């Protein structure tokens, strides 16, 4: 396995920051070496290749450097657009090979925000056609990561995020509670608690 | 103006045969290699393999090599990532990628726009709404729905400020759900069922 490992696997920064990725190779490869840009939903995008070498129409604030085995990606001013996640690469040209870095992804630096906590119970609709889905809401916090604690007076629950809030560097959680109408109705009150370094102690609701 | 550009969304069952493309403009295809990347939702890129357009030369990443069949056809500057027998574990980002230089295996500088695979054994299938009933939040949730996507605005694009619409999950059943939050209602589009909810 020629592997290549990005540090770190996220980096929370402010527009204005030099920041540094780094990317280390398992095997000494010189400077073949690339670096690529990905935002949300596009494609990726070349910024540096033979380890130090800017693709025309990147930006100067971008630089690369390093040989054999240890390699890095340099902002030296962080702007609104340098918030994606960026790859490295091993590639040769003599032999084919291309090798990327599991990423890293560079997202906006914010104070600490608790998350406002909602829940909702089943819909009189749903409850009629088979299933109960109780959805818990943790609204508006940083930083991205939040415990999820489902309490019925496991592996029957589902999550997903937001992604960052642009103009106010947050993110959102929703929980799916998936059971059936009776796990459902034997139960009566219901319960969300949520773990987040925003909050002295976890809250529920 | 140099560009690859990719054929459109795949949404298949397994078993099925698949074959997308990529087509270059604006310089001699035959002169460069096409590179194919994957990227699985929620995950970084992986190289496929890399084909010589000139001559069809060939070559895969060790894991994928028998589990893909990379093709070209030189004469309409179009390269092929083709699948006899897709899995469910197929589904996925394709990209299609260029060297910056001719016969070399450099970086990749041009990229298509990449072709979303949905490899599933579910069939098409609309979403039920539900609301989520109560400053103050409420929402939709938007369940049990094939394929993605489908598209939630409030009050018919009035009302946007407060509005978190979630990626969707997907649920064991191979049915997706998702949430919309900011009973009063909700306007949910799914195109794949023509099925179009306002709640």
């Known amino acids: 396995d020629i592997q290549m490992t990005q540090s770190p696997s996220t980096l929370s ?37 033979k380890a130090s070498s800017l693709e025309s129409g990147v930006p100067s604030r971008f630089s690369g450097s390093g040989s054999g085995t240890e390699f890095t990606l340099t902002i030296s001013s962080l702007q609104p657009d340098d918030f994606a996640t960026y790859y490295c690469q091993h590639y040769n040209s003599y032999s084919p090979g291309y090798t990327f870095g599991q ?103 | 103006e140099v560009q690859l550009v990719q054929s459109g969304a795949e949404v298949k069952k397994p078993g099925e045969s698949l074959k997308i493309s990529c087509k270059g403009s604006g310089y001699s295809f035959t002169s460069y290699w096409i590179g194919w990347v994957r990227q699985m939702p929620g995950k970084g890129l992986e190289w496929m393999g890399i084909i010589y357009p000139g001559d069809s030369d060939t070559r895969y990443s060790p894991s994928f090599q028998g589990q893909v069949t990379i ?57 039920s709404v539900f609301p989520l009933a109560p400053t103050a939040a409420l929402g939709c949730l938007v369940k049990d729905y094939f394929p993605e996507p489908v598209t939630v605005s409030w009050n018919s694009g009035a009302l946007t400020s407060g509005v978190h619409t979630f990626p969707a999950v997907l649920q064991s059943s191979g049915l997706y759900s998702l949430s919309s939050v900011v009973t009063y209602i909700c306007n949910v589009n799914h195109k794949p069922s023509n099925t179009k909810v306002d709640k």
């Open chain 1, 13 to 49: 920064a402010s527009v204005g920051d030099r920041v540094t990725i780094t990317c280390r190779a398992s095997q000494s490869i010189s400077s073949w070496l690339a670096w690529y840009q990905q935002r949300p939903g596009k494609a990726p995008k070349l910024l540096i290749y």
């Open chain 1, 103 to 205: 990423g890293t992804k560079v997202e906006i630096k914010r104070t600490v925000a608790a998350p406002s906590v909602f829940i909702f119970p089943p819909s009189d609709e749903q409850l009629k056609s088979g299933t109960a889905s109780v959805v818990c809401l943790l609204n508006n916090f940083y930083p991205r990561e939040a415990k999820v604690q489902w309490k019925v007076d496991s592996g029957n629950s589902q999550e997903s995020v937001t992604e960052q809030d642009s103009k106010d560097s947050t993110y959102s959680l929703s929980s799916t509670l998936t059971l059936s109408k009776a796990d459902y109705e034997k139960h009566k009150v219901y319960a969300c608690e949520v773990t987040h370094q925003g909050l002295s102690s976890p809250v529920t609701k």
């Open chain 2, 71 to 127: 093709s070209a056809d030189k004469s309409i500057s179009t390269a092929y990532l083709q699948w006899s027998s897709l899995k469910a574990s197929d589904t996925a980002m394709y990209y299609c990628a260029r060297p910056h230089y001719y016969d070399s295996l450099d970086a990749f500088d041009i990229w298509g726009q990449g072709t979303m695979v949905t490899v599933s054994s579910a069939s098409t299938k609309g979403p």
